[PDB]
Amino acid sequence: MDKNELVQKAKLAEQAERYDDMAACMKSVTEQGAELSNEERNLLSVAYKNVVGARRSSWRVVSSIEQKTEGAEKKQQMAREYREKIETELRDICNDVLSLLEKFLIPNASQAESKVFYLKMKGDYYRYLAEVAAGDDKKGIVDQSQQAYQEAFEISKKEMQPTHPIRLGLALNFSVFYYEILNSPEKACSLAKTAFDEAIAELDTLSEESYKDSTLIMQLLRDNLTLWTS
């Protein structure tokens, strides 16, 4: 269809919470090759966040059942096979996202704001793969998530103000990566604290388009900080 018709069909799908439809239309928009607007960027991120999030949440439930059914072979093996089916869906969803990122989104990002947005997205979806990977492939997947986050981090530090919502959201997920993937509560906390303190020293720099997203992310950074220290 028309690119803008695709985008408004994605908006319809979002309000209906039909996120498979939403991702299908935002994937079609991306594949037309033009750089995404900030609004198209958000819909694509919202669409796949919910498509992959359903699998992440279902994986965690079924994984917990697999571990608590030891001694019940038939039920443990049944849980394991279902866990493996959800894992294949999860991995296929993340490869779909990471391949749009490598062919269209990252190479065509003209501004640092969008470059940081897409490198963070690459870090997120490799982190989601790391949540379910086994030692063999996990080391490389973890490294792929860390180097996308790290490059986004350096670009954001040099090109974006400390209260920029994209820079703040990246620090949040990068801090989560350190805590949950690398299991380093120290580094997660110092990253979250530095982003929070540097943002709160420049609240004058908040625009009216950005203040509610920036202040929310700041609250979440401090939530994690208070959860990871006690």
Partner: peptide
């Protein structure tokens, strides 16, 4: 946890 949808 991580960044939610806004």
């Amino acid at each position: 946890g991580s960044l939610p949808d806004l």
